[PDB]
Amino acid sequence: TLLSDFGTPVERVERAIDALRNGRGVMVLDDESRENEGDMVFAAEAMTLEQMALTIRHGSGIVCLCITDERRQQLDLPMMVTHNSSQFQTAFTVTIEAAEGVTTGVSAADRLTTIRKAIADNAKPADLNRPGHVFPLRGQPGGVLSRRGHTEASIDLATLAGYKPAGVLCELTNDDGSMAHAPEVIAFAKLHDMPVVTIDDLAAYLQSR
């Protein structure tokens, strides 16, 4: 297969976990859906300013903060809609902005600050203004074993990496406005030292944990 350079399925999850542990990002690739999608993925707790800038530069710029229901409930974040008519049930909450520490909310530093506040150990609802320029997604309980989404993969990988169970993701896009396909995702992975792992890889891997 196209991913051999990153290792076997096991080795791929293992190396993704290791990248995260060492403050790098990973490319999570969907192999299994009608539209394949490669996402830039970081552990929220670990993410750096330069990584947020990289993410905005090369992704959709709709940078999502993937969170547990527990976390979502702690922040009193209701779902953006009560009736979700999105094609793949994409789990957006109401959007958020740090109540302190930001200006407009849009800069890489700003988005980071709101992510940091959201995931902070004793984070309170009042810590967040709504709406804003950071887009929380509610992970399905059970992670990739319940829903093979990049949202769930980012949370499962953060946790596998021994971080707080919170991901940051953004879809890799090309400068012409097309979304990256598997070859372009691999090219990007190789050039930015962010290994590729498929949601299948991860799913398989946890089924046996």
Next chain:
Amino acid sequence: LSDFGTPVERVERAIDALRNGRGVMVLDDESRENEGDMVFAAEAMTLEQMALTIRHGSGIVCLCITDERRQQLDLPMMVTHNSSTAFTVTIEAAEGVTTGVSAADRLTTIRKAIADNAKPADLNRPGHVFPLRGQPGGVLSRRGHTEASIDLATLAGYKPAGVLCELTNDDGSMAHAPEVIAFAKLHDMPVVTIDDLAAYLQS
């Protein structure tokens, strides 16, 4: 900023840019946080423009719409009580898209939204295009980029709907006035300030 003209010549030139299927840089030079946004008339925006806008902006590409339009589409406000910016619930085209995130797809969503006989069922929620409700009265009521985009579309003879995105640098900092000017000059997208536009409308 005199490279672009006088205050009146700046609004006249922005309007013309839009008329001819180009973008404009709308600059806030009166708030504490100065901000330059890429601005297009919705009805006129092309694919290459949507790509440019994702590439160099925040990527949070907003569709600025009248209250009329928002109620035609049965778009409630995202929040019932705003602690923040007038975000509506977010939208995807119900037909004609896949994931919604490509430049082609965002455009297809925008086109469905502003189309003459658009109905709520035309849009799935949530999605990856972010409508913003303009305040009644435009810039004369609220000197925001959201209002400016709608007032410029209208001045330019389009449906009263803008697309906007905040210009960002590759290092994740937001563009300031020098950078907004450089980008404008490089992409043939004229700079106009919200003050410029407000004055021009007052008359």
